[PDB]
Amino acid sequence: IDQIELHLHPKWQQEVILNLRSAFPNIQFIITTHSPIVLSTIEKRCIREFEPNDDGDQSFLDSPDMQTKGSENAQILEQVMNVHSTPPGIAESHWLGNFELLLLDNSGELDNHSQVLYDQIKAHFGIDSIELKKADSLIRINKMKNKLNKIRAEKGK
Amino acid sequence: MTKQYERKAKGGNLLSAFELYQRNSDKAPGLGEMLVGEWFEMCRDYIQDGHVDESGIFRPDNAFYLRRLTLKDFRRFSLLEIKLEEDLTVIIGNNGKGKTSILYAIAKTLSWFVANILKEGGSGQRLSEMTDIKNDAEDRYSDVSSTFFFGKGLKSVPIRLSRSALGTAERRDSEVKPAKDLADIWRVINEVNTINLPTFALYNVERSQPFNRNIKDNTGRREERFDAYSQTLGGAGRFDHFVEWYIYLHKRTVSDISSSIKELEQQVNDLQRTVDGGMVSVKSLLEQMKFKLSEAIERNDAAVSSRVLTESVQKSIVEKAICSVVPSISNIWVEMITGSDLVKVTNDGHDVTIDQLSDGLRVFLSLVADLARRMVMLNPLLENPLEGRGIVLIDQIELHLHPKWQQEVILNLRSAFPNIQFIITTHSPIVLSTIEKRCIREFEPNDDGDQSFLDSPDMQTKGSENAQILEQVMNVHSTPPGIAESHWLGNFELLLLDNSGELDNHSQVLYDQIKAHFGIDSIELKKADSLIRINKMKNKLNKIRAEKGK
Amino acid sequence: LEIKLEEDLTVIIGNNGKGKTSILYAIAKTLSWFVANILKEGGSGQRLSEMTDIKNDAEDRYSDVSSTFFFGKGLKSVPIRLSRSALGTAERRDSEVKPAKDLADIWRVINEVNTINLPTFALYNVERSQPFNRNIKDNTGRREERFDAYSQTLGGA
Numbered sequence: 001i002d003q004i005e006l007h008l009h010p011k012w013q014q015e016v017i018l019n020l021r022s023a024f025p026n027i028q029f030i031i032t033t034h035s036p037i038v039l040s041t042i043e044k045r046c047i048r049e050f051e052p053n054d055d056g057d058q059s060f061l062d063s064p065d066m067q068t069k070g071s072e073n074a075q076i077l078e079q080v081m082n083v084h085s086t087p088p089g090i091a092e093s094h095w096l097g098n099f100e101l102l103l104l105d106n107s108g109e110l111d112n113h114s115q116v117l118y119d120q121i122k123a124h125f126g127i128d129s130i131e132l133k134k135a136d137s138l139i140r141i142n143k144m145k146n147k148l149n150k151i152r153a154e155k156g157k
Numbered sequence: 158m159t160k161q162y163e164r165k166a167k168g169g170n171l172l173s174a175f176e177l178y179q180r181n182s183d184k185a186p187g188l189g190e191m192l193v194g195e196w197f198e199m200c201r202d203y204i205q206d207g208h209v210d211e212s213g214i215f216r217p218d219n220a221f222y223l224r225r226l227t228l229k230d231f232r233r234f235s236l237l238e239i240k241l242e243e244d245l246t247v248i249i250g251n252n253g254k255g256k257t258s259i260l261y262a263i264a265k266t267l268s269w270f271v272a273n274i275l276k277e278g279g280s281g282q283r284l285s286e287m288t289d290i291k292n293d294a295e296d297r298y299s300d301v302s303s304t305f306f307f308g309k310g311l312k313s314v315p316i317r318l319s320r321s322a323l324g325t326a327e328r329r330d331s332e333v334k335p336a337k338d339l340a341d342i343w344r345v346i347n348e349v350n351t352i353n354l355p356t357f358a359l360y361n362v363e364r365s366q367p368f369n370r371n372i373k374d375n376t377g378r379r380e381e382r383f384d385a386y387s388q389t390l391g392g393a394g395r396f397d398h399f400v401e402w403y404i405y406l407h408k409r410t411v412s413d414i415s416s417s418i419k420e421l422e423q424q425v426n427d428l429q430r431t432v433d434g435g436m437v438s439v440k441s442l443l444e445q446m447k448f449k450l451s452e453a454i455e456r457n458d459a460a461v462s463s464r465v466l467t468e469s470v471q472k473s474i475v476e477k478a479i480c481s482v483v484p485s486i487s488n489i490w491v492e493m494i495t496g497s498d499l500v501k502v503t504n505d506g507h508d509v510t511i512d513q514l515s516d517g518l519r520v521f522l523s524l525v526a527d528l529a530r531r532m533v534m535l536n537p538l539l540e541n542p543l544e545g546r547g548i549v550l551i552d553q554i555e556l557h558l559h560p561k562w563q564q565e566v567i568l569n570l571r572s573a574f575p576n577i578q579f580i581i582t583t584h585s586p587i588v589l590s591t592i593e594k595r596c597i598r599e600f601e602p603n604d605d606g607d608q609s610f611l612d613s614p615d616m617q618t619k620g621s622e623n624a625q626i627l628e629q630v631m632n633v634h635s636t637p638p639g640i641a642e643s644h645w646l647g648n649f650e651l652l653l654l655d656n657s658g659e660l661d662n663h664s665q666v667l668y669d670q671i672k673a674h675f676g677i678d679s680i681e682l683k684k685a686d687s688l689i690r691i692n693k694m695k696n697k698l699n700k701i702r703a704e705k706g707k
Numbered sequence: 708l709e710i711k712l713e714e715d716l717t718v719i720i721g722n723n724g725k726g727k728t729s730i731l732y733a734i735a736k737t738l739s740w741f742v743a744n745i746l747k748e749g750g751s752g753q754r755l756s757e758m759t760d761i762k763n764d765a766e767d768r769y770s771d772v773s774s775t776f777f778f779g780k781g782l783k784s785v786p787i788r789l790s791r792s793a794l795g796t797a798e799r800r801d802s803e804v805k806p807a808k809d810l811a812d813i814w815r816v817i818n819e820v821n822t823i824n825l826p827t828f829a830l831y832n833v834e835r836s837q838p839f840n841r842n843i844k845d846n847t848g849r850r851e852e853r854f855d856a857y858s859q860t861l862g863g864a
Contacts, residue, residue, distance in 0.1 A: 001831045002727070002728055002731050002830075002831065002832045002833055003557065003833055006833070006835070006836060007252075007362065007553065007584070007836060008252065008584070009250075009251050009252045009584055009631075010584065010585070010586070010627065010631055010633055011251065011631070011633045012252065014633065014637045014638070014639060015637075015639050017716070018639050021715070021716060027827065028712075028713075028714060028715060028716075028717075029715070029716045029717070030712060030716075030717050030719070030731065030734060031716065031717065031718050031719070032718070032719045032720070032727040032728065032730075032731060033718060033720060034557075034558070034559045034560060034720070035560075036560070036623075037627075037637075038718075039718065039720070040636070040637050040640070040643075041637050041639065041640055042716065042718050045713065046713055046715075046716045046717055046718050047718045047720060048710065048717060048718065048719045048720070049720055049721065050719070050720065050721025050722065050725040050726070050727070051721075052721075052722060054725070055506070056708075056726070058708065059708070059709060060708075060709055061708060061709070061710050061711075061719070066676075066679075067674060067675050067676055067679070069640055069642055069674075070636060070637070070640045070641075070642030070643035070645070070674070070675075071636070071643075071675070071679075071680075071681075072624060072635045072636060072680065073623060073624065073627060073635050074622060074623045074624035074635060075680055077560060077623055080720070081559075081560060081561075081720070082561070083559075083560045083561050083564070083587075084564070085622045085623050085624065086590070086620065086621070086622045086623075087564040087565075087587075087590050087591050087620075088564075089564060089565050089568050089591065090590070090591055090619060090620045092619055092620030093620045095620070124617060124619075124620070125617050125620075125621070126616065126617055128616075129616065129617065129621075130625060131620075131621070362836060363836070363837070363838060365833060365836060367834065485723070485724060504724055505724075507763065507764075509763065512758070512759060513759055513763075514724070515723045515724045515728070516728065516833050517723045518723045518724060557723070557833070558723070559722050559723050561722065562723070
């Protein structure tokens, strides 16, 4: 079967391999795919991984180092398929990294540009977004660590 | 009669000026030439007028796009309305939800535009009665409605396509008169003084076709401007027409007029100097040669006289589109060394022909190549023909593409084709991670066709990650439910939560089994260690609180 | 390239232009000999083409596809080699398919003496997802014939 995930929603990719291997238990299936959701139902020993930087001169075709059966699809996408979970072509992806870099570039406290970009993150992702949740957790951790560093360096002289 | 028509034409409406143009076209020439000329020139300024922005991209002042679609008793839908976006609209949902059906309805609507641009009083495609009518529908007829927008002059272009059942004996009619009027003004201003026409293209999932190199019967002329409307809304792109057109561009960067002129004339003159005594027994070949020379001295005069872009800059613009959108390809050419004129592409490294490509780097190549070809033929008066108006319907844009290249397919398409309104359907969260929430029209999973409004998701998908988009927008879990190994972290969470937080025998053997299945460098084992130490931290804080007070 | 396919399920992953379709196509060309010699005595399966199968940078101008099958402890190795030389070359390379001929001849002979269960070889390429028309019904082959089950079982859809 070449590209078993053809035209299938990622809800029927979670069970296509299990259904096929339960109905046809003695057929040897040899299958190609581009989907971490299909790979999440397949053992690591059943996977033959092509390296991204090969020229066709490799003498073997090997399994990954990560057990994919039962793993998260984002973890399989990052590790097995060598693909970012969050896209690098979108400038809105690196906003949280630039935000925490700006927080460390300050004294750990919020200033004008970091507050503007945090409001940008707020108005982009929304109230219940986990990007905002990680952003406010970063604010809490760095802002309280400022007072920790101050109270430890007061007695250090 | 025309006293308020002149004011309506001066106010920024082109239909009234078109009516005065049509009334004064068959009037007395000479003295009446100036008024019909200035109203025609006003219509041409309204169509052609636009400006480059600060980004260097041509933006027309009067854009053309579909803005609202209504399906009544059409296929699985009872009554549904979609407010489509100006630039990108993504339709997502489960299998058998109706996303290939919305694109089919929009293609049936745009077929009338294509047909009435092509021919005066042409008839486009219409709805079927065996499939398009809703089963167990009490009305026994279906219709689709579109409300196209063509600037401030035409705020609404209402088109209805109706069809009754196979034997219900009704005469439901399609309202295609504003489509007729808009395509008729496009055709008449084009034939008087050529204008940049809009493109319409449908790329259904039956563009995954085996490539046959020759298959060359292809009835029609591949250089004529109204060949970009030939089989455009029919599923597969005409990649065979593209490769013949590209071969003709390669052999028209000097070496085809050479063939039509020099060798044909020299064969004809050799026969003419042979037959100076007459003698039909070799004069038989000569009349065939002279007729072939006449046939090739046609199909060239229009190519020189009706030429706005030169025949090499079209090739350069098409190559720029290919190597800008399609990721692995970096150069594309035609080589004639063999004598079969074969097109070759450059992957990462090696130079291979089009037969030896993949089936996801060739299908996407055929899509981009056909769309760039149709825009180059249909938009000759621009410095970049890909900054042209149109509507393109792509069905499952993420077809046969690796998730590395689904992260940039939409960005490349919307960066190379800025003025196309794309109306796509996807099945992948990698593609939706690069698309804003307002461009997404989802179907709920608990849907049976009675809904009347497709709405955006509640979370922003642009810049979000695959796990969160897949769990909240696709509404499917990251860990698969069918794999019993995927519930072990949750079971470990419950067998820690019910106890105080110390590892008992069952929690210890579950930790050992999680470690043995996943490994030592796994997110599941790291998360289990984090839960163990935060529950020990909870117990330590509770013991310190109990020692402090009671 | 050397592949160590699993007994039950094997999944081949990688980018586009890595050769997974080529691997499945090579296996289908190998299994066509088994299918054709199950149907007809002295039959011939498909063979590698001269235009696409040979590498464009091959210095030897021939291509080999060497498969090794397993049929129990009694017959542990069934070798089969599909070889093809380049077009316009005086040197010609033959294919050694004799163990495949022997095994499929055995299957056909035992079947025609006393009816046995036959293995199911199938390829499901991207060549599927063609549109369905109910009106195409006229065909030759008598669909209820058991050996009609091998009718176009490989080659795509």
